[PDB]
């Protein structure tokens, strides 16, 4: 798995690949790993698929309930804290996951949450077996001044590089952009393919 | 001598404590619902009571989720607890199955919670009626639910003090498949028919949903156009 | 003095609270069942109290599974709870043994749940009667069950306000091993005999099942054909 | 003042609620049992209703296991629950020890369950009497059991409305070691003498068992031979 | 006012429900015990009803173990439960320590169980008196125990309807250290003195035990020799 | 006869025990809250009354957290328990989410706890009203909450014996967006109008909070400047 | 109105049920205790009645341990249960700390058990008073304890029917620090003063303990020397 | 009648059962507390009843720990249970945090336990008032606490039958920051003024504590100087 | 074991073989591994037989009950989600199974569910020890434009190839076809044998 979340001035960009393996065995080429969980909030999953998927269902349920109850969206930091409390509670019987939570409240945020509920905000982050390759690309090529078009290219590049070197990563790249103006928007596959073609890439 | 304990049938087979809970419902403001072409709406009379009150915070219409709303009448604390129950219960179904296929099952869970409070000593019934309205996989749905946990699905229905006048009006005048704006106009007329004593209708609350969409709450400028 | 508490026998050995729950049943709409050649059917009258109701919803005849169905009279909310209990209880048996061999055993579990609610302080009885009808490994079956948890097996029977007239009629007119149409025609006649002063029978609910088949619910036009 | 709760002794040391539960028993159909040579039998007066009742379906005589049967009188739902209890309690004893050596212990467990229901508030007594008949490692056995959980062992006995007539008749007519056929005849004779105003005994239920065999339930046809 | 609930003291400090429970005991059949030279005995009367009853299942003197027997009077089903309690409680002591050193502790556990049923709401007292008789390490023992859980140790004593007569007789006629035959003779005379006009007394139950030995139940033919 | 138990509805659908608990609330010292420009304040009448009493502690205005305060009227010990409940409940939310986004939800948890005490046998309602005031993500907030668990959001409001006077004064004189000092002056004036004629207001408690800051309690001297 | 339940205070702040429990205590036999030079003693009267009773058991004076004894008056079964509780509580303390330093704490544990039965519904108070006497690390101790769980420590004191006579006698005659023989003599004289006149004293129970020793019970012979 | 159950409000919003509990408190022996220069003291009158009573014992003034003491009035066994609660609750705080920073939180825990016993059916209130006095991290502290769980902090206060006379004396004679000896003098005088017509103070209990010290309990000949 | 589910334009085809082994020991030649669990829903089982058979009974009962309660069949994704939640709940004391759920709601679906409740939808899927052999055939020969008749032939080919190479697979091939028109239809075994003969296959 490879997932990534980056913040820009007034934007969050999140992307994943789609490969699902049992060891070397590629079971599914088109699994889903990036989800909208609230109006301006997305989440990526990595680690045990059944644990991650249950957590995706809980967060969609709870973030909706909260908003109904509060008449505002849960702050992204509050989402991360909720998760962090839940995972830590069961740390000796854990959800075996790495999670990215990204979104916009008054500002863009990306949080990274581990299986024991440790949660840290960062300007960008990556999870899964492909993440070290991703951090290579972002360290070299990330700028806080990038536009949304540039950040989108950047995560396509990061993930493409990871798919070349991580056999547990593969398949189509999914990308969502999150802003105050449009909310959470999933980019159409035809647009990602066009950018992969324009940037000179494969897989 | 038969009307003092919820667990006591009268000789004619009546549960008077349940009947008395439905009297509490008759004292609430009037609310109505109606199905229209590919849609369903809710309207609620706002009994205004002081300029010192925050208007925006009093809501009789409550979203259960993006596709399901309710309006209540009767004991307000009771109602609020039932709405909380309905909200938790919807999310539980969505976690379990991934979606809420048929709204009738949610309403039945709420109605079962209420029914249980009419069968056991040491508890009182909820003094509440609800109208639930939304879109599921069957289509637009409209249900009411009373203190006994009695449910009915409706084309159009009402609760609260002006229930009988509103139901009467709608039996005379309601037809299936009206465009949204005619359904709203008809609902406002039905509501006005219940006021009596040359009483002025102040801006009510309105919400609607049509197939393929999420609920919308009419802002107060939009409601005025029908007044 | 002796009719206030379910746990209290009268000096003649009666439980009046159980008897008063029966009175709630007598106020419900008439329903009937009858056995015919290789089959069993149920017919149900429907009290209709507004054209605003979706009448093809909250139905009187309820499938318990594909081979068993129930019809109820008395408190509706209580009836719902008992039908939910019968359904869960049917599936538990299926999971345990792989099938439901004898419908009498399902009926007894429902009837035991009802019996319980006549023996413990702090609970009221269910104000409900049920007819169960279906096919098991013995053949076509027809049972009834009252608020006391008293059950009986029948060739033909009825519940609700018209019970007495319908049973009268059937006791004169009923024949074993009629073909389906004729059984249905007899049942409508019986139902019609209970109506009073030129009162018209609107289209009731009718469901039937025969050996080797699943239940069918007659739709609107098939029922009117008999009206 | 002293007859409203099972936990209240009257000044004379009586428990009137328990006495009122007996009264329900008295309203039931007569049944009897008697020991014959190497055996024991039970006979039950059925008691009718319409030709619309499935005959041979809610039997008054109930097998507890292959070697033990019971018959009851009084509240029918209570009675079913006590028979289900007796069936499970016998199987528990068979699992524990491999067999049921002495039927009196089974009757005691059933009678202790009934006794509990005369001592704890919030509970009513079972409005039931039972006769148990079977064979154990001691020989043919016959016991009765009342709402109080009082038990007696007998050579012959009866329960239900016709009890005193039946017992009076047996008290002069009954002979120790009769053959099955003659025991059955005496039984029917005794049962008939309890009907008033030249009333006609339609086919009762009959069951018997003799040492080294399992129970037999007489067919409707085999009973007629005695009528 | 003060005699309806076990938890209510009267202004004179009395517990009327417990006193009414002692009335139930006065209605039972008469039984007595008495110590003699190196031993103790129990004698129970009982009215046999019909000749259709089984004697031998006749149930008055109950072994608690090989060294300890009881007789009871009052409500029979209550008495069976207390006798089962005593038996299981004697075995628990025997398992714990390997034996029962002092019968008085057994009687106290039973009496403590009966005391609790005079202190908690929701429960009625046991309407029973018991006599316990046997041998332990102290010697031959004789105790009684009443519905309040009050115990006394005796040289001779009695319970049941003829108690007062029997106690009076033994008051004048009892002597310590009689041979067994003289004790049984005196016991039989004391029992006879308690009968009215012309009764003569049918064969009662008799049981005795002497130091170094286990209980013996005199059988029908041994008892006859004393009549 | 419908006013003795919280679980008993009257024939008009009222819960008199809950209305009687309100009566307790009307006996307390008058307190009020008001929203002003970018803030909210609370003022409390201190009915001090004895020189031997410490004029420093058991205050009417209690901080719930640094951003939320409450003032209560009615049963004092009940009020302390609800304040303790509110403080713990605020911390639970802050630990779960990192902050308290909307104060309405805190008020609802407090009000739900109150509501629960109007529905179950064996408990009495809390004899308390609260006003909550503070700043959350939405801005300055002002709520009240009664024994029934009913809540409302306000621009200004009051509780205690002078509620009615204070509210009359404010419905006439209240203006939105006053700077702090004019809001306090208006509040003091509002509170003076409630006193019985010719009775001098001693220093009330005063607390206020503005967007971006924590609460401040006005010291004894700063209050005097307004007297 | 106010004297039917322990949980109900009268308008004057009284618990009548607890006061009625104290009336049971007054019907018991007189017992006394007194401190003498380096020790403490108990004397118990017993109206022993019938010669059929074994006089040598069910003693009024009960050892709690080797250094502590009690004597009770009131309901005998209650008293037994409280004595069982005291013995087990003493041993619990010994196991925990290795010894019982101060007898006052054991007495408070018994009295707290009694207090709790005056505060919770569903239960009646113990109808018992106890005196405790013994030696601990402080010296010889003497306490009484009543149905309310009220305790006092004494130089001399009495319980039972003759309490007041005994106490008024000791008020004038008692001296501190008498030798054992003179203390018993005074005790015996105090008890005789409480007698009915012409009525004589038939050998009480007497027990004593002095610092450094365990309790001695006076044998039947040594008591007579004092009469 | 609204005064029979603790969970029943009167139409005026009163809890009469709680008001009756505070009548019990009016019958106890008078006690008082007062703050002086850098300290606080407590004084208690003892109703001495006989020279046979050991007077060193069952003190009115009870240390809760080295820095905090209480004195109680009302039901003596109830008060003992609350003093036990206070002691353990003090220790729990000390274990949790290392120290008891503010005595008010200890008093609130005690008062919360008392408030509970006025809200739930099946319990009665404690018939007790307490004064707590000691030194915490704030300084010298004096609180009282009544059956309702109502608390106040004071400079001087009293409880028990002489409360009204003591408080009125202190109202006019009390001054803050008296040296210890002058505080005690005034305290003694305050107590003397509550005694009826030529009665005499029989040496009260006195205890005091000053900043940086532990409590001291005045001995007999120390209290003697003040009388 | 070998099981397979494939989707076509308006159909789901599911197939298994029938061998039940304990190590090398062929205990049963005709176990059943393909079940109808609802009107247009089938399930295949692999893994521990007891665990899988309990799940089959549960799913039959719950989907029949859901249908009665809702008046409509449970959507296929909702079936997979139900199983996902049930299996993840007992993660640490698991059902040791691999399931395929196939069916028709508004579209054809195949979901693959693992012992930790990880659930992924696919165009086709195979489970059991024989599955890698089936993925070979499917990768090489599957087409979305196939007819039901060719789809039936493909799965027989794929399972026959797996039986040749996987000793824990064997026995008769059971095939079911699910369409909106005809519902769930288990093909007659004589029809399967005829297709086997015609394709030139053995065993």
Swiss-Prot record, chains A, I:
Transmembrane residue ranges: none
Q: Which EC numbers characterise this protein's activity in its record?
A: 3.4.25.1
Q: Tell me the active site.
A: 1 (nucleophile)
Can you quote a single GO CC term? proteasome core complex, beta-subunit complex
The GO biological-process annotations, alphabetized, read as: proteasomal protein catabolic process
Gene3D superfamilies under this entry?
A: Glutamine Phosphoribosylpyrophosphate, subunit 1, domain 1
What does UniProt list under activity regulation? The formation of the proteasomal ATPase PAN-20S proteasome complex, via the docking of the C-termini of PAN into the intersubunit pockets in the alpha-rings, triggers opening of the gate for substrate entry. Interconversion between the open-gate and close-gate conformations leads to a dynamic regulation of the 20S proteasome proteolysis activity.
Query: What NCBIfam families has UniProt attached to this entry?
Result: arc_protsome_B
Assembly notes: The 20S proteasome core is composed of 14 alpha and 14 beta subunits that assemble into four stacked heptameric rings, resulting in a barrel-shaped structure. The two inner rings, each composed of seven catalytic beta subunits, are sandwiched by two outer rings, each composed of seven alpha subunits. The catalytic chamber with the active sites is on the inside of the barrel. Has a gated structure, the ends of the cylinder being occluded by the N-termini of the alpha-subunits. Is capped at one or both ends by the proteasome regulatory ATPase, PAN.
**Could you share any additional remarks the record makes about this protein?**
The configuration of the closed gate contains an opening large enough to allow rapid entry of tetrapeptides but able to impede the entry of proteins and longer peptides.
What role is this protein assigned?
Answer: Component of the proteasome core, a large protease complex with broad specificity involved in protein degradation. The T.acidophilum proteasome is able to cleave oligopeptides after Tyr, Leu, Phe, and to a lesser extent after Glu and Arg. Thus, displays chymotrypsin-like activity and low level of caspase-like and trypsin-like activities.
This chain's protein is named Proteasome subunit beta
> What is the species of this protein?
Thermoplasma acidophilum (strain ATCC 25905 / DSM 1728 / JCM 9062 / NBRC 15155 / AMRC-C165)
Swiss-Prot record, chains B, C, D, E, F, G, H:
A GO cellular component annotation in the UniProt record: proteasome core complex, alpha-subunit complex
Q: Name one Pfam family in it.
A: Proteasome
User: Where is the protein localized?
Assistant: Cytoplasm
Q: Name one GO biological process term.
A: ubiquitin-dependent protein catabolic process
Instruction: Tell me what the record says results from residue 76 to A.
Output: No effect on PAN's ability to stimulate gate opening
Quaternary data: The 20S proteasome core is composed of 14 alpha and 14 beta subunits that assemble into four stacked heptameric rings, resulting in a barrel-shaped structure. The two inner rings, each composed of seven catalytic beta subunits, are sandwiched by two outer rings, each composed of seven alpha subunits. The catalytic chamber with the active sites is on the inside of the barrel. Has a gated structure, the ends of the cylinder being occluded by the N-termini of the alpha-subunits. Is capped at one or both ends by the proteasome regulatory ATPase, PAN.
Q: Which family does it belong to?
A: Belongs to the peptidase T1A family.
Q: What else is known?
A: The configuration of the closed gate contains an opening large enough to allow rapid entry of tetrapeptides but able to impede the entry of proteins and longer peptides.
State the name under which the record lists this protein.
Proteasome subunit alpha
Give me the gene this protein comes from.
Answer: psmA
């Amino acid at each position: 798995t490879t997932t990534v979340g980056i913040t820009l001035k007034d934007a969050v960009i999140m992307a994943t690949e789609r490969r699902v393996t049992m060891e070397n065995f590629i079971m599914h080429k088109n699994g889903k790993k990036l989800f909208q969980i609230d109006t301006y909030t997305g989440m990526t999953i990595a680690g045990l698929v059944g644990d991650a998927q249950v957590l995706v269902r809980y967060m969609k349920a709870e973030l909706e309930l909260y908003r109904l109850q509060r008449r505002v969206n849960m702050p992204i930091e509050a989402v991360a804290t909720l998760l962090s409390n839940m995972l830590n509670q069961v740390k000796y019987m854990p959800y075996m996951v790495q999670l990215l939570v990204g979104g916009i409240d008054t500002a863009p945020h990306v949080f990274s949450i581990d299986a024991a509920g440790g949660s840290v905000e960062d300007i960008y982050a990556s999870t899964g077996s492909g993440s070290p390759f991703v951090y290579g690309v972002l360290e070299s090529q990330y700028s806080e001044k990038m536009t949304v078009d540039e950040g989108v290219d950047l995560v396509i590049r990061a993930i493409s590089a990871a798919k070349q070197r991580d056999s547990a990563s593969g398949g189509m790249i999914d990308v969502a952009v999150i802003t105050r103006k449009d909310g959470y928007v999933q980019l159409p596959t035809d647009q990602i393919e066009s950018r992969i073609r324009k940037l000179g890439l494969i897989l | 001598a038969y009307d003092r304990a919820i667990t006591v049938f009268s000789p004619d087979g009546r549960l008077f404590q349940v009947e008395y809970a439905r009297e509490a419902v008759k004292k609430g403001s009037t609310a109505l619902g109606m199905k229209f072409a590919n849609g369903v709406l809710l309207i609620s009379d706002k009994k205004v009571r002081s300029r010192l009150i925050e208007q925006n915070s009093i809501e009789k219409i409550q979203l259960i989720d993006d596709y399901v709303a309710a309006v209540t009448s009767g004991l307000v604390a009771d109602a609020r607890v039932l709405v909380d129950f309905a909200r938790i219960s919807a999310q539980q179904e969505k976690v379990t199955y991934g979606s809420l296929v048929n709204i009738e099952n949610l309403v039945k869970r709420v109605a079962d919670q209420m029914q249980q409070y009419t069968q056991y000593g040491g508890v009182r019934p909820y003094g509440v009626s609800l109208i639930f309205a939304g879109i599921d996989q069957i289509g637009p749905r409209l249900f009411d639910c009373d203190p006994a946990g009695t449910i009915n699905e409706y084309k159009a229905t009402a609760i609260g003090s002006g229930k009988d006048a509103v139901v009467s009006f709608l039996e005379r005048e309601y037809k299936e498949n009206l465009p949204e704006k005619e359904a709203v106009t008809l609902g406002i007329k039905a509501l006005k028919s219940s006021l009596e004593e040359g009483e002025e209708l102040k801006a009510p609350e309105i919400a609607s949903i049509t197939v393929g969409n999420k609920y919308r709450i009419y802002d107060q400028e939009e409601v005025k156009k029908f007044l």
